[PDB]
A paper describes a structure:
RCD1 is the founding member of a plant‐specific protein family characterized by a central domain with sequence similarity to the catalytic domain of Poly‐(ADP‐ribose)‐polymerases (PARPs) (Lamb et al., 2012). In addition to the central PARP domain, RCD1 and its paralogue SIMILAR TO RCD ONE1 (SRO1) have an N‐terminal WWE domain and a C‐terminal RST domain. RCD1 and sequence‐related proteins localize to the plant cell nucleus and bind several transcription factors via their RST domains, possibly explaining why loss of RCD1 function affects plant development and several stress signaling pathways (Katiyar‐Agarwal et al., 2006; Jaspers et al., 2009; You et al., 2014).
Our crystal structure of the RCD1 PARP domain provides first insights into plant PARP domains, and we identified several molecular differences between RCD1's PARP domain and the catalytic domain of mammalian PARPs. However, the RCD1 PARP domain structure confirmed that the amino acid triad H‐Y‐E, constituting the active site of mammalian and plant PARPs, is not conserved in RCD1 (Kleine et al., 2008; Jaspers et al., 2010). Nonconservation of the His and Tyr residues critical for NAD+ binding in canonical ADP‐ribosyl‐transferases suggests that the RCD1 PARP domain does not bind NAD+ and therefore is likely to lack canonical PARP activity. Consistent with this inference, the RCD1 PARP domain is not stabilized by 6(5H)‐phenanthridinone, an inhibitor of mammalian PARPs (Wahlberg et al., 2012), at elevated temperatures. Conceivably, the cleft of RCD1 that corresponds to the catalytic center of active PARPs has evolved to bind other small compounds. To test whether this region of the protein is required for the biological function of RCD1, we designed three RCD1 mutant variants with single amino acid exchanges in the cleft region. Nonconservation of the H‐Y‐E triad and our finding that RCD1 retains its biological function when amino acids within the presumed active site are mutated suggest that the protein does not have PARP activity.
Author numbering: 273 to 350, 353 to 452
Write the structure that this text describes.
């Protein structure tokens, strides 16, 4: 996608919160990001061959200014791992639902918030049954987890998959009211 489409995705997806000014949309562009994209695209090939369909989706990851620098070289295991009602992994918000996690993006010293748009290899999606103690796939037939099959709001990528199945691509800088 281009930066305008990402901006539009974020604007339509946060409309319910009122005035949400988008200050900037950026894309990670470096030798490490390229190598990390190549790694991700090989996992896409593998998951496609294994399941028939890689089922790559866009999803939103709440971030903060302080972790952006680190994210490409050392991975998502900086600090992005959360425990929810659905289990433990990386929790991302579906493409049309950034309103859901916008407030969970930490404000920096200037009032600015940061949300990352990621490509996620969801593969064969497991409908999650609400197990607090789940930290991996409920079975060999499933890859990553989702809360609702028809209208997804939350994806759970298991810890084992965090570096293979998520490519952080775009950073959206924004503000909210009080």
């Amino acid at each position: 996608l281009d930066k305008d489409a990402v901006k539009k995705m974020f604007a339509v997806g946060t409309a319910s919160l009122g005035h949400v000014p988008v200050l900037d949309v950026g894309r990670f562009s470096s030798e490490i990001a390229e190598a990390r994209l190549a790694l991700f695209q090989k996992q896409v090939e593998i998951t496609k061959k294994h399941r028939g369909d890689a089922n790559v989706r866009y999803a939103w990851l709440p971030a903060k200014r302080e972790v952006l620098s680190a994210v490409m070289m050392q991975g998502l295991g900086v600090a992005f791992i959360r425990k929810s009602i659905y289990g433990v992994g990386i929790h991302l918000t579906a493409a049309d639902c950034p309103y859901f996690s916008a407030r969970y993006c930490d404000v920096d010293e200037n009032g600015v918030r940061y949300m990352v748009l990621c490509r996620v290899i969801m593969g064969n999606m497991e409908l999650l049954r609400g197990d607090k103690a789940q930290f991996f796939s409920g079975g060999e037939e499933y890859d990553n987890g989702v809360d609702d099959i028809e209208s997804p709001k939350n994806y759970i990528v298991w810890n084992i998959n965090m570096n293979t199945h998520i490519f952080p691509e775009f950073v959206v800088r924004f503000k909210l009211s009080n």
